[PDB]
UniProtKB/Swiss-Prot annotation, chain A:
Part of the U5 snRNP complex. Component of the U4/U6-U5 tri-snRNP complex composed of the U4, U6 and U5 snRNAs and at least PRPF3, PRPF4, PRPF6, PRPF8, PRPF31, SNRNP200, TXNL4A, SNRNP40, DDX23, CD2BP2, PPIH, SNU13, EFTUD2, SART1 and USP39. Component of the U5.U4atac/U6atac snRNP complexes in U12-dependent spliceosomes. Within the minor spliceosome, which acts on U12-type introns, interacts with PPIL2 and RBM48. Core component of U2-type precatalytic, catalytic and postcatalytic spliceosomal complexes. Found in a mRNA splicing-dependent exon junction complex (EJC) with SRRM1. Disulfide bonds: none annotated. It comes from Homo sapiens. It comes from the Eukaryota. Widely expressed. The chain holds residues 683 to 779 of 2335 of the full protein. This is Pre-mRNA-processing-splicing factor 8.
From Swiss-Prot, chain B:
Component of the 17S U2 SnRNP complex of the spliceosome, a large ribonucleoprotein complex that removes introns from transcribed pre-mRNAs. The 17S U2 SnRNP complex (1) directly participates in early spliceosome assembly and (2) mediates recognition of the intron branch site during pre-mRNA splicing by promoting the selection of the pre-mRNA branch-site adenosine, the nucleophile for the first step of splicing. SURP motif 2 mediates direct binding to SF3A3. It comes from Homo sapiens (Human). Ubiquitously expressed. The modification Phosphotyrosine is found at Y48. This is Splicing factor 3A subunit 1. The chain holds residues 409 to 489 of 793 of the full protein. It is found in: Nucleus; Nucleus speckle.
Swiss-Prot record, chain D:
Phosphorylated by PRP4K during spliceosome assembly. The gene is PRPF6. It comes from Homo sapiens (Human). This is Pre-mRNA-processing factor 6. The modification Phosphoserine is found at S48. It is linked to Retinitis pigmentosa 60: A retinal dystrophy belonging to the group of pigmentary retinopathies. Retinitis pigmentosa is characterized by retinal pigment deposits visible on fundus examination and primary loss of rod photoreceptor cells followed by secondary loss of cone photoreceptors. Patients typically have night vision blindness and loss of midperipheral visual field. As their condition progresses, they lose their far peripheral visual field and eventually central vision as well. Involved in pre-mRNA splicing as component of the U4/U6-U5 tri-snRNP complex, one of the building blocks of the spliceosome. Enhances dihydrotestosterone-induced transactivation activity of AR, as well as dexamethasone-induced transactivation activity of NR3C1, but does not affect estrogen-induced transactivation.
Curated annotation (Swiss-Prot), chain E:
The U4/U6-U5 tri-snRNP complex is a building block of the precatalytic spliceosome (spliceosome B complex). Component of the U4/U6-U5 tri-snRNP complex composed of the U4, U6 and U5 snRNAs and at least PRPF3, PRPF4, PRPF6, PRPF8, PRPF31, SNRNP200, TXNL4A, SNRNP40, SNRPB, SNRPD1, SNRPD2, SNRPD3, SNRPE, SNRPF, SNRPG, DDX23, CD2BP2, PPIH, SNU13, EFTUD2, SART1 and USP39, plus LSM2, LSM3, LSM4, LSM5, LSM6, LSM7 and LSM8. It is found in: Nucleus. The chain holds residues 340 to 555 of 565 of the full protein. Its main location: nucleus. Deubiquitinating enzyme that plays a role in many cellular processes including cellular antiviral response, epithelial morphogenesis, DNA repair or B-cell development. Plays a role in pre-mRNA splicing as a component of the U4/U6-U5 tri-snRNP, one of the building blocks of the precatalytic spliceosome. Specifically regulates immunoglobulin gene rearrangement in a spliceosome-dependent manner, which involves modulating chromatin interactions at the Igh locus and therefore plays an essential role in B-cell development. Belongs to the peptidase C19 family. Coiled coil: none annotated. This is Ubiquitin carboxyl-terminal hydrolase 39. It comes from Homo sapiens (Human). GO terms for biological process: cell division; mRNA processing; mRNA splicing, via spliceosome; protein deubiquitination; RNA splicing; spliceosomal complex assembly.
Amino acid sequence: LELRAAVMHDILDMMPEGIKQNKARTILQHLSEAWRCWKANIPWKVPGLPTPIENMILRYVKAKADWWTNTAHYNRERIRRGATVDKTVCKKNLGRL
Amino acid sequence: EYLVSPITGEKIPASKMQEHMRIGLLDPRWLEQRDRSIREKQSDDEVYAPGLDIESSLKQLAERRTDIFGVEETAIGKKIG
Amino acid sequence: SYMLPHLHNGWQVDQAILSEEDRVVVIRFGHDWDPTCMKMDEVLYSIAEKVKNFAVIYLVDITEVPDFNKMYELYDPCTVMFFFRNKHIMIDLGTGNNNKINWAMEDKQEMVDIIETVYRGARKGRGLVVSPKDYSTKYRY
Amino acid sequence: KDDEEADAIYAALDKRMDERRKERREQREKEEIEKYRMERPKIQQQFSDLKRKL
Amino acid sequence: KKKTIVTDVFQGSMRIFTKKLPHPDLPAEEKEQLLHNDEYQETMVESTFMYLTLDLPTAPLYKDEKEQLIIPQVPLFNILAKFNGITEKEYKTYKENFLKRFQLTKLPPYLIFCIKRFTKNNFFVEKNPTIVNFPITNVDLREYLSEEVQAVHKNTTYDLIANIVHDGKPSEGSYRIHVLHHGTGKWYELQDLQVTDILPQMITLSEAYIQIWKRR
RNA sequence: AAGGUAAGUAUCGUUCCA
């Protein structure tokens, strides 16, 4: 939540204050789509996206993917070592793995 | 060039008979689903905030979480330190 | 969190409870910057569209609206209150407190489960509904 | 206005009581987070340059 | 002994112009006044290097739409384009970013190119497996020096001598070495006792980590 | 110390408070 909030905060901050600010949900959907595409290992290349927006979204995806990998491996270590974990935690961890 | 409409039996231009057959058999009950879902979305009320509201809420959240935003770090709930 | 509609003063939340009759008003009292409140203010994001038919979600910052802290016991970091036709729908959890969900959960299906159960028990005309899951533990093992 | 004065007196007394190590503990935590901010930076300034490039 | 047997071989003089406080938290007018203050501008930061560092583009992180999992090949001159006034890298650190532009003012007899493959993320250290297309017997570096210094050097061409290639993850690695036997042109691959006269193409195909040159 | 409140509709008493 903090990383996505920071990315959206920066993008909306440098985005011009006009009526165009109606496009906040569009930016969030773009972020979610890029994250899904990385999760689904599918090529993601928006044609009309500006290169600075694309660069920032790539950096967001890379950072969240690094955290995703580390968290998945740490949770797996917790589970194999015998630590006490939740059922939904096991389900999400199995999906990530 | 004139042709004869297979459905109405009236002289028709030969250039239009293709889309004439496409559209003269337009299924009558299709009109409501064209004119029903659009009314539903016209009367539908939004679920998420307007974009300016997301912007303002993001500013307010940045005001507090200095562990992420700002340059002068402070407590989680504190405005500035 | 930031995506859901927000209420700024005391009148607005009372109106939002009153301005609806055919759904359930799910209000997340707390602080959207809280790690706890942000944990479930994204669950409430992921299901806001799904439960549009029978639920509307408003967010309230108790510091911005310091009018319901004393009456509804707003002192846990995060609180969820369900209202139906201007009537607080009590819900019986596994926890001792049966008026609120004062903890942020993780699964997007269970919250829709609870909201739909509240709606089902509120159409009948009850005041206390019973949750399907039991929260006297965490099922961790 | 005696109630407000009494409350202010007690609050000032309590605030005086925390001055036993306030100046040292706050400085220690200030120096302590700055060692943490090296290995683990902030997200916003991690996106500082791209935000500028926007 | 500012100049010893190893200093006058690999060390080279380097110029750095560094600007500070470009931070986005500053508004437009405040940053305009800051650059107007004449306190925060490019500075004389000439020093010495034992080896030139090479910063690579990040891994693609996405499959190419036509050929999935495409291998990222980048020409060497793109990397070496860092060392000129045209390009400037933001070595952000702590609170304020630092925009530095690099320049070469004394080419050492032998130029060492270290390659920043292994880097720590916010959470875990990874490697940057970006292949580089680099020649071995013809390269020109004259564009990276100021003309008031370019006249001194009549030899800006370097030939590869040794190459370092790493295997796998940082915690499980096995170095391999491509050595050039001078006089001949036999490039030999040594890992622990390996000896194999490779062709000048397997040097390009593999991902380099440390390169040794010779100005001749 | 808990995780053990069924939710309601009535007249009646009291009390602060407007």
